Amino acid sequence: TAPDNLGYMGGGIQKTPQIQVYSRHPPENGKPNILNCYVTQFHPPHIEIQMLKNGKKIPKVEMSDMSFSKDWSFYILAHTEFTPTETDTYACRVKHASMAEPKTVYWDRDMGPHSMRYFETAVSRPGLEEPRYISVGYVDNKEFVRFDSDAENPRYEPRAPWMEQEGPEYWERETQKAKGQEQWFRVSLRNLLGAYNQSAGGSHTLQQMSGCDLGSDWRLLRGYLQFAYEGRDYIALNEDLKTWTAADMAAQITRRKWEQSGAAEHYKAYLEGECVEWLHRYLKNGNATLLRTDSPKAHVTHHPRSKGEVTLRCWALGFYPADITLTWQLNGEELTQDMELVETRPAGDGTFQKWASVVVPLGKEQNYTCRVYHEGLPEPLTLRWEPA
Numbered sequence: 001t002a003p004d005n006l007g008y009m010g011g012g013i014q015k016t017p018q019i020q021v022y023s024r025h026p027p028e029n030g031k032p033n034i035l036n037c038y039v040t041q042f043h044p045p046h047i048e049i050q051m052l053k054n055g056k057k058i059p060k061v062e063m064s065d066m067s068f069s070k071d072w073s074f075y076i077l078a079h080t081e082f083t084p085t086e087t088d089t090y091a092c093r094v095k096h097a098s099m100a101e102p103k104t105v106y107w108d109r110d111m112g113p114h115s116m117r118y119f120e121t122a123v124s125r126p127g128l129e130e131p132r133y134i135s136v137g138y139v140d141n142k143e144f145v146r147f148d149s150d151a152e153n154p155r156y157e158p159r160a161p162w163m164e165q166e167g168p169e170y171w172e173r174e175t176q177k178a179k180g181q182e183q184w185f186r187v188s189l190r191n192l193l194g195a196y197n198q199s200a201g202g203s204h205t206l207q208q209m210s211g212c213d214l215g216s217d218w219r220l221l222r223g224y225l226q227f228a229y230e231g232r233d234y235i236a237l238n239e240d241l242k243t244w245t246a247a248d249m250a251a252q253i254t255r256r257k258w259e260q261s262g263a264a265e266h267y268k269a270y271l272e273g274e275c276v277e278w279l280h281r282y283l284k285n286g287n288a289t290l291l292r293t294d295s296p297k298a299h300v301t302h303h304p305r306s307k308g309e310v311t312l313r314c315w316a317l318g319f320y321p322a323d324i325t326l327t328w329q330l331n332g333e334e335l336t337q338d339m340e341l342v343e344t345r346p347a348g349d350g351t352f353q354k355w356a357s358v359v360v361p362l363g364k365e366q367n368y369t370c371r372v373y374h375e376g377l378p379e380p381l382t383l384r385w386e387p388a
């Protein structure tokens with residue numbers, strides 16, 4: 001169930017994408033596969049991504065829908081069917097305002113327990129009175145509804161199959177709230193443009209995160225309600241659900257207005273009331289799919305580098321949910337950030353992939369162990385380089 005904001009924001013900077021290109025399955029020449037280009041941590045959300053086979057645009061490339069992470073940054077997965085061979089090369093090319101020129105990345109084949117969230121975004125459009133407004137609802141970090149003002153018939157739509165259980169009055173009620181949010185983001189965007197002495201020629205973004213965490217007994221643990229302007233923290237409701245934290249001077253004015261009108265009480269009532277009750281219903285209705293876990297399959301690869309050193313890479317593949325911890329230790333003693341990680345990445349089939357590497361001296365590989373922590377496991381894994 002989505003929130004309905006009340007008072008508006010008061011009135012009167014980019015992030016470079018990180019790009020991984022990687023196959024879903026371990027590549028074998030002649031064997032069909034999927035190539036992924038996962039683009040994360042960028043802002044603003046407008047981005048152009050192309051996949052290229054031998055320098056030519058690949059015609060059928062799937063793109064995920066606009067999404068952002070808890071740090072406000074946007075991410076996208078593009079992917080395509082492909083059959084690796086010895087001589088074909090593949091790349092992902094990304095154009096984004098943070099970069100003067102498009103960036104081409106070549107595929108280097110050789111390398112509480114429950115929650116609901118509504119992640120909402122409004123992007124102002126230089127010549128149009130109305131921004132684009134997208135809202136994405138999540139249940140246990142799995143997308144379950146989505147609204148996008150750019151659709152031909154904008155409505156909340158089910159994004160998890162079990163949401164077929166809601167009748168028409170549900171979609172209508174939720175859609176009407178999305179329309180109210182659209183108007184609110186529009187007003188706030190305009191107020192913010194004056195609050196910061198900006199001109200309308202530009203594009204600007206306002207984002208919201210709202211929802212609730214529950215314990216394993218399904219009792220409320222914490223509610224959340226926070227906003228970002230231009231991808232930067234603006235104001236957040238504190239954990240008491242009564243007081244606000246303002247990130248800067250503009251946001252303090254808003255905080256003062258909202259304390260005077262008691263806005264926190266309205267959001268408090270939503271977070272502790274409908275947010276919880278509707279999450280209960282969604283937990284029950286989506287029972288069959290929300291319990292699923294996939295244990296990581298882990299192994300260590302061995303990469304001799306210059307000098308007498310080696311890189312050990314500890315891989316975890318095939319796992320769900322995406323939360324995982326990979327650590328390297330030396331004789332049971334863990335290394336305080338000596339190691340190279342990679343952002344966890346979707347394989348595209350519902351599981352995820354991650355690795356972590358350390359540089360060690362040749363001959364001393366057996367002193368190092370990798371440990372994998374994941375809730376799908378019966379217990380944490382311990383592994384080490386295993387030669388032939």
Ligand SMILES: *[C@@H]1O[C@H](CO)[C@@H](O)[C@H](O)[C@H]1NC(C)=O
Pocket residue numbers: 283284287288
């Ligand atoms: C979820 O499904 C399992 C397996 O059928 C069932 O035993 C359990 O009681 C269900 N729980 C809820 C909350 O629906």
Ligand SMILES: *[C@@H]1O[C@H](CO)[C@@H](O)[C@H](O)[C@H]1NC(C)=O
Pocket residue numbers: 331366367
């Ligand atoms: C590293 O492994 C070797 C060979 O198994 C072992 O003898 C040695 O004690 C280990 N080094 C340390 C510092 O524990």
